[PDB]
């Protein structure tokens, strides 16, 4: 049902983490990646 | 408004044809499309093809819910039909 719009809200299925975040935060965590990483906070779907 | 009137006919035509024959969903949709007003078919031709495909796959997912949707005139396409 339209991807069950609660899996999409909870990132069980839908847009990847590098995509639903505002471009500018993913850009931020991209630069300051060697120190103070933000990769492990946001989760992304892995639908089969 | 005009499109919804076509939807009501499709629900009844498919349901009636499955009543009299119980044919395959593809055959039921084919007989429904061939018994429409030419003005109605021509004006909303892109809509009908989209409507048939969603109804065919919705019956493909689960016919029990499909029967309820047909037997519910209050039924309206859920979003996601649109996009």
């Amino acid at each position: 049902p339209s991807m069950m719009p609660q899996w999409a809200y909870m990132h069980i299925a839908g847009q990847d983490a590098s995509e639903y975040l505002s471009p500018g935060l993913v850009q931020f965590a991209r630069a300051t990646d060697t120190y103070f990483s933000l990769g492990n906070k946001f989760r992304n779907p892995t639908v089969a | 408004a005009e499109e919804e009137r076509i939807l009501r006919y499709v629900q009844q035509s498919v349901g009636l044809f499955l009543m009299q024959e119980g044919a395959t969903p593809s055959a039921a949709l084919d007989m429904t499309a061939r018994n429409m007003e030419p003005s109605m078919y021509a004006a909303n031709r892109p809509f009908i093809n989209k409507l048939m495909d969603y109804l065919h796959r919705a019956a493909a997912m689960n016919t029990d819910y499909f029967t309820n949707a047909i037997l519910n005139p209050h039924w309206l396409p859920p979003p996601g039909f649109y996009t």
Partner: protein
């Protein structure tokens, strides 16, 4: 040359293993949300389990 007739018995030892039976079509991790996990959503029905 004085060995006695014998019967072979086998076994195996497993630990820190925790047997798993994935809910995929082919028992294969093609994704976190398994293939059958989506089918159960579209079917939209209830099923017990024994």
């Amino acid at each position: 040359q004085t060995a006695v007739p014998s019967v072979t018995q086998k076994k195996f030892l497993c630990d820190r293993v925790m047997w798993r039976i994935p809910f995929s079509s082919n028992f294969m991790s093609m994704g976190a949300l398994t293939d059958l996990g989506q089918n159960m959503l579209y079917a939209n029905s209830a099923h017990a389990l024994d």
